[PDB]
User: What shape does this take?
Amino acid sequence: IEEFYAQFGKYILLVPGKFTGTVAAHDLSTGRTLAWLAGWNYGDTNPIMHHMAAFPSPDPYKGFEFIVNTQGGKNLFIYGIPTTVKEPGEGFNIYRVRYDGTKFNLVSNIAEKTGLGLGVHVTATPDGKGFAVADGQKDIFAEFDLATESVRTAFLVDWKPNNSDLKRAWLEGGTMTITRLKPTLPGGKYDYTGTKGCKIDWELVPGGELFLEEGKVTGTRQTNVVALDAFVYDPRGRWGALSARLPGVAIIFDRQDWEPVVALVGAKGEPSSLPVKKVASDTWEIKMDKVVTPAHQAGFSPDGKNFLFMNGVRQNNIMVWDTSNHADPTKWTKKAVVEDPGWRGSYPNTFHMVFTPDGRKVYVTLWWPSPTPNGIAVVDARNWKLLKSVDIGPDMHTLAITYDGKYVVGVFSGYQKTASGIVIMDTKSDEVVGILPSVGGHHDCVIVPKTVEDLRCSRCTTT
Amino acid sequence: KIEEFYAQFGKYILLVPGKFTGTVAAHDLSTGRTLAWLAGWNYGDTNPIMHHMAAFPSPDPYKGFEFIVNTQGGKNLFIYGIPTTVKEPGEGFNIYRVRYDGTKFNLVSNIAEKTGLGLGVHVTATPDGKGFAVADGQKDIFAEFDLATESVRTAFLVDWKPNNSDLKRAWLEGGTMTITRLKPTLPGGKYDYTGTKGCKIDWELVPGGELFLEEGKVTGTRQTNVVALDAFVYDPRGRWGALSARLPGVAIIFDRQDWEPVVALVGAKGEPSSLPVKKVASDTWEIKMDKVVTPAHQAGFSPDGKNFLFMNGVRQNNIMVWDTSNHADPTKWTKKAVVEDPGWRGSYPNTFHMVFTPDGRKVYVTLWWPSPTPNGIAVVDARNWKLLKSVDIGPDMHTLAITYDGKYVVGVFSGYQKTASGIVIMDTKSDEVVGILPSVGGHHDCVIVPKTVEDLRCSRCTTT
Ligand SMILES: [Cu+2]
Ligand SMILES: [Cu+2]
Ligand SMILES: [Cu+2]
Ligand SMILES: [Cu+2]
Ligand SMILES: [Cu+2]
Ligand SMILES: [Cu+2]
Ligand SMILES: [Cu+2]
Ligand code: NA
Assistant: This one.
């Protein structure tokens, strides 16, 4: 067994636990868990540990830092756990955690310091000195400076539907408005702690994008939701892509002047992009005459020359843009679309991804609801053809890769109530080399990076 | 491919509680998958220190099984170094029945709320698989429960009256231990001991913590009346149970047929095998001790029931063994061997949790130390009563279970709730570690789901 682990190399796997309330680092070279922390011990009464990213450390085994965030409110009530809790904790914390070579230290709550409570993807910036967080119930994203724990920028995104009827509010198109946000409380604090700011009272769960149009999700501004998901970074610098699941759009922002420059449109058969028009000193718009399908997971390739966005449910595919023109995102155009006849139903959804460091392949999860086994698609990232699908387990989420390129490491999470695990796949044979047990509902995972170059294949360039 | 690893382990499911993680989980050791987990805080349990557990026989665990897991609460949250600013920790002391249904866990009931008894230390299944006991060493109460009707069969309180009321001498100089059969005091035949109610001390005497009380490190309203009950372990032959009391270093044998204590075994080397029990009221018994030589903690019978072990701790670190082959008469149980080692002569290691092989030829015993000394597993020849070998594992070693075919010991270590943790598997032929699996857990227990009553002889029933 130690022979088993000695193949993997000295890589540390970090995972949040979703409804377990924990975060944990595992030493893939020995099978030992190095450290873990349980949010509830600190008085977080609803620690839905959601997403995270880790910063470059010259020796992760001596120390490393990471951000992990949580959801809260009625997000406790949507995974089927028959809890009698009446008033769930507000959550939406953004925790800075440092491993000191023995234990995790809860260093700070960045959500409490800044007033932005945001509970979906966390991504590191490519120089490892800042991070972004987005939220799909509030439709806000921000980028943060790690050293000062302060907001660099924050934006609200809003939908104005053509047809105010809920079932048609996205299908018949609408106007997306992007507004740069400014702090409203004393001290330069934002007023978005806890559940404050929500358009809907819980998130749109994996594979659940259409649940809002279907009348399944309560809240006060249902038809104004776009479900922001993530801000992923071009590894070349300068640009980030903000995914918005309901319009199926990735808005490219220029991080130099903090403006949106163009809007990629996910659906197959739809234009490569739509323009972003500025309408006010801090406000921009995108007009869409229709929305063919929602989309979710998004990512750049290691060299930044491709960007992927996974259309889901109304279409299940991998949409690929040629992003090789780093100077001009209005040049980025659809170059390929990975499809398969077996993805013609509502599920599976093409899901989380990770590229090999050499950019030659991308691994993409295939998610279904219970009880179909969920899996990993292996895709040739030179000719954009599906090579292989491999079944893994129920409710498969994210993939990380060891930074030598030799093993993909993924998690599945049992819909928070059935089987869960860590899977390791050998990238030479594309076969599963083992399952390790995992007490986790993880929707995320990362391998602690040593360099900035490692972030190109980490929770920086992709979800 | 680890599947080669896992195919050798066999079809066995390991359950572990997470202590400070607040979870309980089952792992399928044949595939490495976690079958199901549950997080107590999801259910509104704000301080779910998931502590001890026992599982009941199931003809096919993979299609379903049930278990009990209980929790601690109150200031137990504050004793493992976690820099929490929480000021009003949940009261805790829940006892949960959980059922795996082949797909997920189902929190079937809260037996503490149902019965009125909040007891947060060892859980042990009875030999027939139809009942279970739970003991508590801050309240010094234990009870046996009927699983089917989720009711109390019997409950007892145990109290110490010291010869010397000075806290540092309150055990050393002896005292009277009083055992009282309790009656429910609330409507519905409920007891009144939910949450922190009944505590004599405000937290459990932590692993390796026995004397923290005499040295004045532990607050509480009845500090010199504590005996720190630990567990009620069962004779696999039936009839008898042994209730361990850490501070007096005694295991009180009870006759489960009429629920009376019958004899008190005394742990310490050089002291008598046992002391008599005197009945002094319809519901009250006494044991008199002229002194207490050392505390004792882990306790258990061999699978055949003919030996009983009690681990002396801190004043002496040894394994005391009684000949219990006389099933008819516990007053005849007499010390027959003690396992000692030069390396056991400091305060630690403390011989701790244990598991015997199905054939009874060996017993594996945890060696626990405070950080930063590597903790491990001792392998003891259970026929000649000699230490064969010690193996280093990792920090904060806890319990050991064994697969029912006898091939693998499976143990947990728990990082003092802050550092490294994991599940260790040890081949019982070579007595070497055959590897570590990751584990997000602070587990102080673990059990492999049994299929038969015979399996329980090597599970959380005969030993802790
Ligand atoms: Cu996402
Ligand atoms: Cu996911
Ligand atoms: Cu998620
Ligand atoms: Cu114990
Ligand atoms: Cu007999
Ligand atoms: Cu223990
Ligand atoms: Cu414990
Ligand atoms: Na009797």
User: Anything to note?
Assistant: Residues A 50, 443 surround copper (II) ion (ligand 3) (CB under 6 Å).
